């Protein structure tokens, strides 16, 4: 007989976002790397 069995476990994205911060967010940290690269560059 032709029938369907529900295999539900990981249904998918039910309004879910995988957009996560990676490799360290900026704010003040990447500016310290940026100006830090300049100060190490000039010296």
């Amino acid at each position: 007989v032709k029938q369907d069995m529900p295999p539900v476990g990981g249904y998918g994205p039910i309004d879910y976002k995988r957009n996560l911060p990676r490799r360290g967010l900026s704010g003040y940290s990447m500016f310290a790397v940026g100006i830090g690269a300049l100060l190490f560059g000039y010296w």
């Binding site: 529900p6 539900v8 998918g12 994205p13 995988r18």
Partner: protein, 370 residues
Amino acid sequence: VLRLVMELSGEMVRKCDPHIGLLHRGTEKLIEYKTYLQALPYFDRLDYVSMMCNEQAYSLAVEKLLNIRPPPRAQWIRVLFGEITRLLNHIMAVTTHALDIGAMTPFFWMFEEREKMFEFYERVSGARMHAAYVRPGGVHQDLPLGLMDDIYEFSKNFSLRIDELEEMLTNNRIWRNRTVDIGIVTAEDALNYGFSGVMLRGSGIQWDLRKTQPYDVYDQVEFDVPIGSRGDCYDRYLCRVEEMRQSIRIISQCLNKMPPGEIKVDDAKVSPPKRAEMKTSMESLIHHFKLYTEGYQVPPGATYTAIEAPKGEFGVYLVSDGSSRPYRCKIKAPGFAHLAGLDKMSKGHMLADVVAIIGTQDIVFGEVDR
């Protein structure tokens, strides 16, 4: 494909008249000489993409004439394949829009996924794309035992696949510079234009069709309808991506709820009988002989249906006599609705802005048939 006669005052477009109908195949007069079962695959070939979202609007319109409710299982096939078209339609609505702009990668990223999508169509119906599958007698052929496990396996892998687009196209400075603030239409004038698809739904107006008017086993399936703030192309883009995200939930709930039983309509006076059944009994073979050559003998009158397309509305208007031939039917596809807006959408916008308008509205040139 499109003529698009431009009147450029200097740099900005003032009068954009889309001289469309360059693909008038003549579906209007040609169906008049065909029966209802014979005229079925014409409405597949109405739009380029929709196959189970198309014919769905036609088969339910024939069902409204015949006063026949399709079997419980067949309706669950109609949603499972109705949403997999809603997945398929919004692939082209994003990718060819990106192709018209100049984005090279995101087109190819979804087309490998799309070629895996047509594997579901192939295993369920002989044709690759245009499948004469959704019929006036509900659903023609049953799902094979192999497919139901593969639908879940695909949706499990689709989760990261849809996340690829939001980690690529939405967060871009280029897109938020380009698509933002092109033809901001939120006004009650848009109701008078009557787009109904993604223009009204994706900006301001809460109204849709799926929630207000159930067609095939709705309210039982959970929905999240995305509604934007501004009438620009970018809000119309994001709601489509959120529609793509809120479609797997419908597919997963369809996988959870599958009542085992009959596929075609129980009455053999409308649905053609099974091959093992027709070769033995007399009544079945006559009904098999008469449902072909002759149509159904439909009740006279006029029906109207509009099941929510990702592009807009397939407003089927069948006018019927006692005979098996439908004398004039008209499907007013979203093409005529969206191309009417271009007189307002282009005012005070550049040449490259017009390219963005056509894609986000998804003006498929097949829509202009009626």
